[PDB]
Design a protein around this ligand. Structure first.
Ligand SMILES: Cc1cc2nc3c(=O)[nH]c(=O)nc-3n(C[C@H](O)[C@H](O)[C@H](O)COP(=O)(O)O)c2cc1C
Ligand SMILES: Cc1cc2nc3c(=O)[nH]c(=O)nc-3n(C[C@H](O)[C@H](O)[C@H](O)COP(=O)(O)O)c2cc1C
Lengths: 200, 201
């Protein structure tokens, strides 16, 4: 098999469970290594990550995200939110990805000739880290989805885990065993997406 | 041979050659399929790409890039620029990655509540398409690098190929045969980069 097979295997999984065959040490090393190997502009390595397990992971969703969402969600709609938060907490853990703003700013100040690009290149590096993790877990038959309850949960997350303010949260990832396969995904016409020129 | 092996094999190759044993059709498929499988915010699919071979690929660096860099690069320094441009054209081809702005705008306009997320999600989607290609090619022992001469060469590239005006260029990737391994790698202190809380049930 090749990389294309793994790419096809990787999908967004919303039905997660706790039946994984890897330990904490193996899960931690898998995640961190996947992120460490993900490239970044000038090897700035602005990628930061928080990995939660057990009660911690579940509390992030059922307590942190929960308390914040009820302050902005309609009463007649909260029931559906609580259930959704539970589905994410039903997994093995949660990964929170951050981008170190102190490193991006240091770059802007020292190399203004590039400045404008540091912010976008930082967002690009985050995406790369996200895909790196997604691929690494998919190969191990571990499912996950990408969530964006930021910056709503930012405040509480930082205080609870003594996270520097410069660590700007960009995504929260619940992961676990795959309890239900994803459905049919759609693709756009390749003709209006790509263009080839030249021969070689 | 897990994913981590491939990740570690993927490096920024600056020494490229023209000795690739894959037909154009296979190269095109490799690149396009890798992009298609790369995810994007609610399957928005804002990634676009232009693959150039031969003269087209060579001209992008020696003509378009060159001409634009020359008009803004110091005389007593342009010498190095030309040398680099030729190292990129010494490969098999070039990949230009764009992000469809028309799609992103339609989202920011209809979703004034999430408007601020689309731009960063687009940049992130671009990075994902980039890494997807970089990995697909590394597995084929095909080297490449990511360059950023945008938006300096935006107008000429868009004109020469008459691309949709919404295709905002984000990167130019020269690929070819790996003529020499990458240097050494540097990693920051992990205890400064990560944090772990909790245990498995
Ligand atoms: C968003 C982003 C922008 C990048 N831009 C450039 C660039 O303009 N020129 C270049 O030579 N390398 C560029 N790179 C490559 C990185 O500098 C390189 O991946 C990093 O130093 C690590 O090296 P490795 O790829 O060999 O592991 C970029 C990487 C990312 C993720
Ligand atoms: C930058 C970026 C942001 C995303 N954000 C969300 C999100 O907020 N919520 C969600 O459920 N999925 C989110 N996704 C996942 C995509 O919707 C999903 O990957 C896409 O529809 C393709 O499906 P697949 O992941 O199953 O291949 C995001 C993906 C990217 C690349």
């Amino acid at each position: 098999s090749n990389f294309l097979d793994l790419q096809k295997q990787r999908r967004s999984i919303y039905a997660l469970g706790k039946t994984v065959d890897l330990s904490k040490a193996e899960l931690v090393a898998l995640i961190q290594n996947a992120i460490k190997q993900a490239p970044s502009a000038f090897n700035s390595q602005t990628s930061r990550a928080l990995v939660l397990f057990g009660q911690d992971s579940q509390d992030f969703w059922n307590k942190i995200a929960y308390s914040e969402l009820e302050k902005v969600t309609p009463a007649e709609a909260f029931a559906g939110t609580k259930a959704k938060l539970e589905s994410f907490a039903a997994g093995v853990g949660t990964i929170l990805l951050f981008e170190d703003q102190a490193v991006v700013r240091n770059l802007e100040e020292n190399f203004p000739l590039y400045a404008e690009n540091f912010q976008p290149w930082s967002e690009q590096a985050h995406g790369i880290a996200l895909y790196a993790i997604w691929l690494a877990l998919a190969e191990q038959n571990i499912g996950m989805s990408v969530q964006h309850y930021n910056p709503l949960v930012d405040a509480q997350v930082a205080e609870k885990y003594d996270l520097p303010t410069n660590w700007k949260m960009r995504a929260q990832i619940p992961f676990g065993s795959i309890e239900a396969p994803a459905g049919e995904k759609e693709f756009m016409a390749d003709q209006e997406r790509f263009k080839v020129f030249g021969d070689l």
